[PDB]
Amino acid sequence: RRDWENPGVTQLNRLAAHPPFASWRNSEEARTDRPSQQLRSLNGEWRFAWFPAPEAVPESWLECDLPEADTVVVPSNWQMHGYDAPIYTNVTYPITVNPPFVPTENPTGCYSLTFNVDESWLQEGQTRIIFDGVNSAFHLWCNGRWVGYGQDSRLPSEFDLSAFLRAGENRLAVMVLRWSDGSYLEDQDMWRMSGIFRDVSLLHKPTTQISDFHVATRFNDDFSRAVLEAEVQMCGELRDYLRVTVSLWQGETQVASGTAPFGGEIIDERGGYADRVTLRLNVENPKLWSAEIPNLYRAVVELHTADGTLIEAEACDVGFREVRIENGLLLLNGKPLLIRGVNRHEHHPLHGQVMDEQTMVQDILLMKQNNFNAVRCSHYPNHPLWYTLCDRYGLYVVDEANIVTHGMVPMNRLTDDPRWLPAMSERVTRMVQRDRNHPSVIIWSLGNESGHGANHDALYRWIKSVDPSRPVQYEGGGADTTATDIICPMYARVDEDQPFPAVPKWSIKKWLSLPGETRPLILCEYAHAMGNSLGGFAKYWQAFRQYPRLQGGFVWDWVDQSLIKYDENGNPWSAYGGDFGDTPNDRQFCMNGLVFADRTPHPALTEAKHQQQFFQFRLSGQTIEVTSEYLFRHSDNELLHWMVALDGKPLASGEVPLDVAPQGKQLIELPELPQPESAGQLWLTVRVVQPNATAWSEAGHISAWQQWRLAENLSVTLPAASHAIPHLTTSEMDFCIELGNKRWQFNRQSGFLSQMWIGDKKQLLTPLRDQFTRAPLDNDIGVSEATRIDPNAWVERWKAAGHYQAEAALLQCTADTLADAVLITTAHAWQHQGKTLFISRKTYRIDGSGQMAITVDVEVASDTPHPARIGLNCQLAQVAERVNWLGLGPQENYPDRLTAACFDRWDLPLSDMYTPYVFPSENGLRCGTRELNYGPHQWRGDFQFNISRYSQQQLMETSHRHLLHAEEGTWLNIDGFHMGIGGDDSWSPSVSAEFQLSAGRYHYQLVWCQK
């Protein structure tokens, strides 16, 4: 038989699914959730051997350990140990599409383990082995005898081993196949790995056992009363003496208990379930669960003799909460949710797809620290510990079946096929059976990108029938089909329709009110955070808030899926698609995270944090209105710091305690601020600070901020009468200006400032020139490649229009000596193949103070694709340590992504002014800057800038950040105008019209002087 090429065989001899078991024999240990002696971990060192095919595996390996084998850590992905290559592919299958067949060359991982079993385990009861995650299919032998087979890489596989194990030493033999018919339903946008990547354990259960238990909570109208209903099921001999006691604990206080014998109510004409019981406990004024306040109870389930012999005890954390969709709104405990979510893949730069507690906690700390309240299990059931953590810290979970068939043509070819229903159902049913008790899980998902098939309908109904407590969602086949309770599009824009045939992505605002439509809209995927992205993010959150039935979304995605590789010197670097010899690959498309692989934040993460704020603010005179977006909690760990500053210089500050009811408001009256004499703009800045530590944040954490412009005094005082008059020297090649120790040189052949002198030292390595192009972002490139050009993408439009190779023809270059200054006037035309793209007219005015006033006026042709930027650049000879500016900061910001930025006097070391995006591009811009200080230099005006050791050319010519070499000096980019970054998706033009440079005629002015 070839079971790994048969969608009719998804397992052999596998035990039934169920919620997390520990088989406690003491009820207090169950209650306290302390470790169980009946649940052993088999994690540790195993013997591993790699083979090109299952046929290649030597018959002796079943009976005896192989000498060639190596000792490896388990859990692990065998790609991470370097046995074969991890493959990154986006849509296209890593194998030839020929269901259900896989290549005869199938990388086979032979794991083994010699382990010990106590006599006591074999003298009584049942001894089983649980494999939490095996990718993608595996056969299991024990002591040489075959046990079974199993598929689905993301759910536990369990087998009874009692009749196989002997006292003391035993040996496992797990032959794991990389490819199987299972792989056809596992086509997620991620690294294609394999092996025993989750926990392995041994569970001893009594013969007469708890085989399943469902916990439910239902509520009276105002949620002041609840009935906890627990349905318990058993295996073994049914006897009159059997009972179940379900007790409910709140810390140490037992709030409810119920005891009944077995034998459920009459179900049908043949009776009821004699092997079942339902316990109903009344709970007065229950503490409710939410991501805001994750109140938990502990439910202990005791199977026992009536006379008081505990046979075994299972347990779980209970969260009293209700999820329902009413009148088109998704409600948690009667209140409409606002999903501040992110899509999270299980990824580690070093370990691949093996999850650990430390990492999982770090993710949840960071998510909650950045105002996320939800997470999508994209696109599979997660590690069991994740759901427990979300229960405890507080995050709404979308639990998603392991069904992705994205590379099928058409996408629903398998999911419409009734012969593929058995395999699909197990990915849905065994998910529900495992996780249905977790309070954190609020929504079920039928998978991702598998079109819409009749199998989606059958399964949707199955979950509705089995579990009435949670809405079922699914995006495939149009995101509003009969398979989903929530409209859940991916990358639907706020206002713009993308009306594809059959599966249009309507404006989310437009979608809600289509003829006959009523359901809530929460995007399963939005704001593609690929490279320099997240532009246009605020547009989403303005809409989410304005529209009741727009209840948020899940950002794509959490972490960059980059992997650590090592160079000739042994130095680590972040690698992506293709870097492991893997081909075909979708290159850097695996990196779309708000955080890097090592969990270092991208600059976009702060933009998400600002938008997902839980407190809204308005200003009216001296009164600040604070509005709470919390649904259940009071502002009981919050105060408001406020700061008024004249262009960076602190004027007045104070603290006011935040006392806002959920959905409520607080009017905070500011003290009469004494206005200053000196000119400038007053800036109010408020920050919500948490004075006290929490489970998720430290004392002094900042949860929210906002800024306003207050009064402005425009400067009417002019500089003093100049102490000298600058001299001009004329040559055929050059205009040269001299004043004190300052010197300027304008080349008359080129028409640019080609050198500058402070004292006697050079100041330039490259002349000051106009620049209308940028090192293309990931959103600029889209899907375009050298082999396969996408002409619609921005980068190709600029290339084809000739923007990158257009050369400056000089039209005018003159010098005039004024009464107190010298005036250099120039004009340039940028041309490509007989087409004028840009004209740049400048005046440079240099007076007796030592200041150079540059005035730029640029014309852009209407029929040329809008330029990336409209500015200047040069390579300064200086290399300073610090960058000091008055403008938006501290972090990187761009026109369509600058709401999180605040205007203040910022001071950073040079290296921070560069964002190390793994795929190098235009980066580190700071907008709305009025003054920039770098070493001896000061620039003043109203500009946008970046400043680093790397040129735009080097940036656009390098594919990985580690290959970047610091150039001589410092590359300075000062733009009057910069195009938006986009990011609604990363495969088609996504920069909004209002952030495109399309005015035709642009003006900006800079003053360059020594500070």
Listed in sequence order, the residues at least 6 apart from 222 whose beta carbon sits closer than 8 Å to its beta carbon are none
Question: Measured between alpha carbons, how far is 590 from 90 in angstroms, rounded to an integer?
Answer: 8
Residues 694-733, one symbol each (x = binds Mg ion by CB under 5 A, - = not), give: -------------x--------------------------
How near is the Cβ of 149 to a copy of itself at its closest, in Å? 10
* 461 contact choice in Na ion, Mg ion, a copy of itself, none (CB below 5 to 8 Å, kind-dependent): a copy of itself
Residues 493-522 that bind a copy of itself (CB under 8 A): 500-503
Do the Cβ atoms of 638 and 672 come closer than 8 Å?
A: no
Binding of Mg ion by 443 (CB under 5 A): no
| Residue nearer to a copy of itself on the CB measure, 430 or 897 | 430
Binding of a copy of itself by 482 (CB under 8 A): yes
3-class secondary structure, 54: helix
Q: Which H or E run contains 128?
A: strand 126-131
| Interacting span for a copy of itself (CB under 8 A) from 98-106, 413-421, 555-563, 932-940 | 413-421
* 965 contact choice in Na ion, Mg ion, a copy of itself, none (CB below 5 to 8 Å, kind-dependent): none
Q: Does 75 sit behind a cis peptide bond, omega within 30 degrees of 0 on the bond before it?
A: yes
| Residue of 409, 714, 718, 819 interacting with a copy of itself (CB under 8 A) | 409
Q: Which residues bind Na ion (CB under 5 A)?
A: 189, 338, 544, 551, 589, 592, 920
| Residue nearer to a copy of itself on the CB measure, 78 or 93 | 93
- List Cβ<8 Å contacts ≥24 apart for 357-366: 357/385, 359/599, 360/385, 360/386, 360/389, 361/389, 362/599, 363/558, 363/559, 363/599, 364/389, 364/390, 364/393, 364/395, 364/696, 365/393, 365/696, 365/697, 366/595, 366/599, 366/601
Question: Measured between alpha carbons, how far is 69 from 46 in angstroms, rounded to an integer?
Answer: 10
Residue 650: Cβ within 10 Å count:
11
| Residue nearer to Na ion on the CB measure, 255 or 486 | 486
Binding of Mg ion by 244 (CB under 5 A): no
| Residue nearer to a copy of itself on the CB measure, 500 or 677 | 500
Residues 582-601, one symbol each (x = binds Mg ion by CB under 5 A, - = not), give: --xx----------------
Binding of a copy of itself by 763 (CB under 8 A): no
Question: Measured between alpha carbons, how far is 302 from 242 in angstroms, rounded to an integer?
Answer: 10
3-class secondary structure, 946: strand
Which residue of the set 186, 302, 525, 796 is catalytic? 525
* 892 contact choice in Na ion, Mg ion, a copy of itself, none (CB below 5 to 8 Å, kind-dependent): none
Question: Measured between alpha carbons, how far is 1002 from 99 in angstroms, rounded to an integer?
Answer: 58
| Residue nearer to a copy of itself on the CB measure, 412 or 784 | 412
Binding of a copy of itself by 8 (CB under 8 A): yes
How near is the Cβ of 991 to a copy of itself at its closest, in Å? 22
Do the Cβ atoms of 715 and 824 come closer than 8 Å?
A: no
3-class secondary structure, 543: helix
| Residue nearer to a copy of itself on the CB measure, 101 or 223 | 101
| Residue nearer to a copy of itself on the CB measure, 400 or 896 | 400
| Interacting span for a copy of itself (CB under 8 A) from 293-301, 425-433, 513-521, 845-853 | 425-433
Binding of a copy of itself by 533 (CB under 8 A): no
3-class secondary structure, 962: helix
Question: Measured between alpha carbons, how far is 43 from 61 in angstroms, rounded to an integer?
Answer: 21
| Residue nearer to a copy of itself on the CB measure, 263 or 334 | 263
How near is the Cβ of 137 to Mg ion at its closest, in Å? 7
| Residue of 55, 70, 118, 265 interacting with a copy of itself (CB under 8 A) | 265
| Residue of 75, 109, 195, 451 interacting with a copy of itself (CB under 8 A) | 451
Reduced DSSP (H G I as helix, E B as strand, rest coil) percent helix, strand, coil of the chain, to 5: 15, 40, 45
Burial environment of residue 15 by CB neighbours within 10 A (0 to 12, 13 to 18, 19 or more): middle
Binding of Mg ion by 6 (CB under 5 A): yes
Interface with Mg ion (CB under 5 A), residue total 7
Residues 217-256, one symbol each (x = binds a copy of itself by CB under 8 A, - = not), give: ----------------------------------------
Q: Does 100 sit behind a cis peptide bond, omega within 30 degrees of 0 on the bond before it?
A: yes
Q: Quick one: three-class SS letters along 869-881?
A: EEEEEEEECCCCC
How near is the Cβ of 552 to Na ion at its closest, in Å? 6
Question: Measured between alpha carbons, how far is 347 from 110 in angstroms, rounded to an integer?
Answer: 24
Do the Cβ atoms of 916 and 893 come closer than 8 Å?
A: no
Interface with a copy of itself (CB under 8 A), residue total 57
How near is the Cβ of 985 to a copy of itself at its closest, in Å? 12
Calculate the dihedral angle through the C-alpha atoms of 594, 599, 602, 607, rounding to the nearest 10 degrees: 60
Do the Cβ atoms of 404 and 188 come closer than 8 Å?
A: yes
Positive or negative, the Cα torsion across 866, 872, 877, 883? Answer: negative
| Residue of 163, 266, 306, 693 interacting with a copy of itself (CB under 8 A) | 266
Binding of a copy of itself by 823 (CB under 8 A): no
How near is the Cβ of 27 to Mg ion at its closest, in Å? 6
Q: Vertex 156, ends 154 and 157: CA angle to 5°? A: 115
Residues 282-341 that bind a copy of itself (CB under 8 A): none
What are the CA-CA distances from residue 936 to residues 909, 928, 965 (Å)? 15, 22, 25
| Residue of 364, 411, 534, 846 interacting with a copy of itself (CB under 8 A) | 411
Which residue of the set 186, 231, 449, 638 is catalytic? 449
Q: Is 449 known to be catalytic?
A: yes
Question: Measured between alpha carbons, how far is 93 from 372 in angstroms, rounded to an integer?
Answer: 32
How near is the Cβ of 434 to a copy of itself at its closest, in Å? 12
Whose CA is closest to 381, among 317, 473, 459, 445?
445
Binding of a copy of itself by 787 (CB under 8 A): no
Residues 163-202 that bind Mg ion (CB under 5 A): 181
The residue assigned the tokens 């290959």 is: 963
Whose CA is closest to 444, among 453, 454, 457, 435?
435
* 189 contact choice in Mg ion, Na ion, a copy of itself, none (CB below 5 to 8 Å, kind-dependent): Na ion
Binding of a copy of itself by 834 (CB under 8 A): no
Q: Which two tokens stand for residue 331?
A: 């409600």
* 707 contact choice in Na ion, Mg ion, a copy of itself, none (CB below 5 to 8 Å, kind-dependent): Mg ion
Question: Measured between alpha carbons, how far is 703 from 635 in angstroms, rounded to an integer?
Answer: 12
* 267 contact choice in a copy of itself, Na ion, Mg ion, none (CB below 5 to 8 Å, kind-dependent): a copy of itself
Please, what is the angle between helix 454-466 and helix 421-435, to 10°? 30
Question: Beta partners for 288?
Answer: 320
| Residue nearer to a copy of itself on the CB measure, 1 or 965 | 1
Binding of a copy of itself by 464 (CB under 8 A): yes
Question: Beta partners for 817?
Answer: 822
Residue 197: Cβ within 10 Å count:
27
| Residue of 459, 640, 972, 974 interacting with a copy of itself (CB under 8 A) | 459
| Interacting span for a copy of itself (CB under 8 A) from 340-348, 464-472, 927-935, 983-991 | 464-472
Binding of a copy of itself by 454 (CB under 8 A): yes
| Interacting span for a copy of itself (CB under 8 A) from 115-123, 474-482, 611-619, 886-894 | 474-482
| Binding site residues, Mg ion, CB under 5 A | 3, 6, 9, 181, 584-585, 707
Q: Which residues bind a copy of itself (CB under 8 A)?
A: 1, 6, 8-12, 16, 265-274, 406-413, 418-419, 421-422, 425-426, 429-430, 433, 449, 451-452, 454-455, 457-462, 464-466, 476-478, 482, 500-503
Active site residue ranges = 449, 525
